[PDB]
Amino acid sequence: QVQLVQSGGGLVQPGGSLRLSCVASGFTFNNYWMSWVRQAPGKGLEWVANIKQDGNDKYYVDSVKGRFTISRDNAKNSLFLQMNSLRAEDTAVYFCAREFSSYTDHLEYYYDYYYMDVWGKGTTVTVSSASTKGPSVFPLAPGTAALGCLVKDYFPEPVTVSWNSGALTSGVHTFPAVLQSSGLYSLSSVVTVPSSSLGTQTYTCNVNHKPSNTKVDKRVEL
Amino acid sequence: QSALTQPASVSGSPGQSITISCTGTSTDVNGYNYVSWYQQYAGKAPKLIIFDVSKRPSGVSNRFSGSKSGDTASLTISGLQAEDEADYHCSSYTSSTPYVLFGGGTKLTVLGQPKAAPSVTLFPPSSEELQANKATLVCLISDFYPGAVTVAWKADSSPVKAGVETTTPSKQSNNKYAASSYLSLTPEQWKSHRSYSCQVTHEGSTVEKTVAPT
Amino acid sequence: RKRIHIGPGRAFYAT
């Protein structure tokens, strides 16, 4: 079948750079215009750039002219995108797509319209000025009772949370993290337990943040 | 001067028909016909389902149809199915760079389960965080459906918008939704007020929780 | 014979 697979995405800081790749298969690559489309978290699509089949004619969206350079190599069914002077607003998932020709001819005139019919799965690009940093773990002190741990200001994702070294798995809810304006993440893990055990049963959340090689076991007391 | 506009979201129940509009497409006779729609499932890549205003790539269900009048393009889905739930983006021509635009995307929800009000738990700043010269209120929202809510905080009884960080909703294992909101304060602010409140609005109804310095 | 070419990033009509 027809396929497109990109790669090269990653995490960098403002001003940094990345080189995206896209390998086609299942179709005559040098017969189509190829494009790069992006999608910022939670937003719509935006065409970034494309290149004619002969690799000469190149087009870009205004916000990346001068910083981004598209190129192709018909010899190896590959499409590339060199990204320089990266910005926070460039953060998004990048897809490479094929432009196909929808030809409708009415003699006196004809329409030659191009749309994207094949898309890759996409590669992620994150541009942030935040630096690797371990989290601060604060306890959320407590019929039943709710108690947990606040895993504050860490970068970048992810972090894992468990309770009593795994012995407590039911009534546990670890919430997706929130990206703060500061560029750092935070999340909360909470568990519901019997109120009568609060006096005898000890509770400890085991937090691990591999990016900064930091583990924290925080005891949550009454 | 140009920007396609499609509603952030729309809902419909199984068996019904639904329509998503997209104003702002070209009225230039030479570009009138350049209109398309793409479907996109969470985490997946887009897929062309309508081009040239109303043509369907082979494989795309005849339940999806496209039309246009004036500058408004419209996508119509009949006999809604649970698998139709996704994001839909309209694309159109515009007489100036970049020549081809995309709408903001419309999130289509197929009401497959009964409404569910959110559960709310609010935590006050921990003495350890306070003693570290900081304060964070944690509002945990869970088990709601549809997956859409808005949060409002209050210092005593007045609105407070500074220092509020709220996540987008996200699907839980039981298939309902969760979200959380954080309010940052100074230990002094925290102790200064009688109490704080986290108010969650969902489908026209609200659940508010309150906490106070002990 | 008016030729209309419309695609991302370019639009024109060849004589």
How far apart (Å, rounded) are the C-alpha atoms in residues B91 and B104? Answer: 10
Q: What tokens appear for A158 in the block?
A: 């992810």
Say if C14 is an interface residue toward chain B (CB within 8 Å): no
For residue B176, CA distances in Å to A98, B83, B85 come to 37, 17, 15
Cβ distance B168 to A42 less than 8 Å, yes or no, reads: yes
Residues A103, A82 contacting (CB under 8 angstroms): no
Residues A178, A106 contacting (CB under 8 angstroms): no
- The per-residue b/e assignment along B29-43, b for 16 or more CB within 10 angstroms, e otherwise, is ebbbbbbbbbbbeee
- Type of residue numbered B126: S
Breaks in chain A (C–N > 2.5 Å) following residue: 142
Q: What tokens appear for B113 in the block?
A: 């389960």
How far apart (Å, rounded) are the C-alpha atoms in residues B18 and B195? Answer: 45
CA A133 to chain CA centroid, Å, is 19
How far apart (Å, rounded) are the C-alpha atoms in residues A203 and A187? Answer: 18
For residue B107, CA distances in Å to B84, B110, B170 come to 10, 10, 14
Q: What tokens appear for B104 in the block?
A: 């903001």
Please report the domains of chain A, with CATH numbers, ordered by start residue: 1-129 (2.60.40.10), 130-220 (2.60.40.10)
Residue partners of A209: CB distance under 8 A and separation at least 6: A134, A135, A154, A159, A215
> Minimal Cα–Cα distance from C15 to chain A, Å?
10
For residue A149, CA distances in Å to A58, B38, B41 come to 52, 41, 33
Radius of gyration (Cα) for chain B, nearest Å? Answer: 22
Residues A72, A80 contacting (CB under 8 angstroms): yes
Residues B118, B51 contacting (CB under 8 angstroms): no
Q: What tokens appear for B69 in the block?
A: 């009048």
3-state secondary structure of A154: strand
- Type of residue numbered A40: A
Which residue shows structure tokens 């209050």?
A: B154
Length of chain C: 15
How far apart (Å, rounded) are the C-alpha atoms in residues A220 and B161? Answer: 30
First CA to last CA across chain B, in angstroms? 55
Please report the domains of chain B, with CATH numbers, ordered by start residue: 1-112 (2.60.40.10), 113-213 (2.60.40.10)
Sheet with A78-83, strands from edge to edge, namely: A3-7, A18-25, A78-83, A68-73
Neighbours of B103 (CB within 10 A): 26
- Structure's resolution in angstroms: 2.4
Nearest to B53 by CA among B75, B23, B80, B70: B75
Please give the backbone phi and psi of residue B192, each rounded to the nearest 5 degrees, phi first: -65, -35
Pairing of strands A123-127, A10-12: parallel
How far apart (Å, rounded) are the C-alpha atoms in residues A28 and A18? Answer: 27
Q: What tokens appear for B186 in the block?
A: 């100074």
Neighbours of A153 (CB within 10 A): 17
Give the long-range contacts of residues B78-83, CB within 8 A, separation 24 or more: B78/B17, B79/B15, B79/B16, B79/B17, B80/B12, B80/B13, B80/B14, B80/B15, B80/B16, B80/B17, B80/B18, B80/B110, B81/B14, B81/B110, B82/B14, B82/B110, B82/B112
Q: Which residues are C13's β-sheet partners?
A: C4
Q: Give the residue numbers in C contacting A (CB under 8 Å), as ranges.
A: 1-10
Nearest to B25 by CA among B68, B85, B80, B84: B68
> Minimal Cα–Cα distance from B191 to chain A, Å?
18
- Type of residue numbered A89: E
Please give the backbone phi and psi of residue A195, each rounded to the nearest 5 degrees, phi first: -60, -30
Q: What tokens appear for B176 in the block?
A: 């309902």
Neighbours of B158 (CB within 10 A): 9
DSSP H/E element including A105:
strand A92-105
How far apart (Å, rounded) are the C-alpha atoms in residues A176 and B178? Answer: 8
Neighbours of A16 (CB within 10 A): 15
Which residue shows structure tokens 């609005």?
A: B201
Q: What tokens appear for B11 in the block?
A: 């809902």
Neighbours of B189 (CB within 10 A): 17
Of A111, A181, A187, the CB nearest to B33: A111
Pairing of strands B72-77, B18-22: antiparallel
* Chain B interface, best mutation among A1, A116, A185, A193, by max B CB count within 10 A: A116
